[PDB]
Amino acid sequence: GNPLVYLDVDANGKPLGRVVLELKADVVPKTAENFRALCTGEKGFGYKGSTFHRVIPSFMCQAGDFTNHNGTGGKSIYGSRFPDENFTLKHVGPGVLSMANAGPNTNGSQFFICTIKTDWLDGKHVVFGHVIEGMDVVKKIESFGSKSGRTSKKIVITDCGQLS
Ligand SMILES: NS(=O)(=O)c1ccc(C(=O)O)cc1
Ligand SMILES: NS(=O)(=O)c1ccc(C(=O)O)cc1
């Protein structure tokens, strides 16, 4: 079936716990595969050790810039960027996992976890999974954000990988 992956997250070195994500490989196989491989690090790069660099309460928690740590970087397993696969899945509510981008067809490695329904992103960001377990951890991360997106604690993905 669809992959299950995990992110173990610290804030200022204190473990927050684990976020488990189901990747909708049945709907968006290319987008799911990129994220899966970046979690395992099997291509020689990925999310381990990188940060949630932009977190906005009552919106979303963004991560995945493992090259520049600031929203400008990241790369996919395919090349620097890859196309929007489809917009079939919608930003239905808290726990949605979706690709960050810089406009059409600019997916790399950056992603966000929604903490509300974000319907205005439908048709603009590729949704590719959802939180299975660990919304408590997501709420903790969210609580360390701000209106500007600046985090008030350093939020690090210490470990990540594939469960099934
Ligand atoms: N003192 S700290 O390392 O900045 C800190 C405090 C609380 C929490 C939490 O609520 O989980 C995480 C980190
Ligand atoms: N809670 S909300 O009014 O839907 C919202 C959405 C986005 C942002 C932001 O980009 O900063 C802030 C608030």
Curated annotation (Swiss-Prot):
Family that this chain belongs to: Belongs to the cyclophilin-type PPIase family.
Known role: PPIase that catalyzes the cis-trans isomerization of proline imidic peptide bonds in oligopeptides and may therefore assist protein folding. Involved in regulation of the mitochondrial permeability transition pore (mPTP). It is proposed that its association with the mPTP is masking a binding site for inhibiting inorganic phosphate (Pi) and promotes the open probability of the mPTP leading to apoptosis or necrosis; the requirement of the PPIase activity for this function is debated. In cooperation with mitochondrial p53/TP53 is involved in activating oxidative stress-induced necrosis.
Residues the record lists as N6-succinyllysine modifications: 24, 43, 132, 147
Mod. after translation: Acetylated at Lys-124; deacetylated at Lys-124 by SIRT3.
GN (gene name): PPIF
EC numbers, comma separated: 5.2.1.8
Portion of the parent chain present: 44 to 207 of 207
Annotated localization: Mitochondrion matrix
Source organism (scientific name): Homo sapiens
GO function terms (MF aspect): cyclosporin A binding; peptidyl-prolyl cis-trans isomerase activity
The protein's name in its UniProt record: Peptidyl-prolyl cis-trans isomerase F, mitochondrial
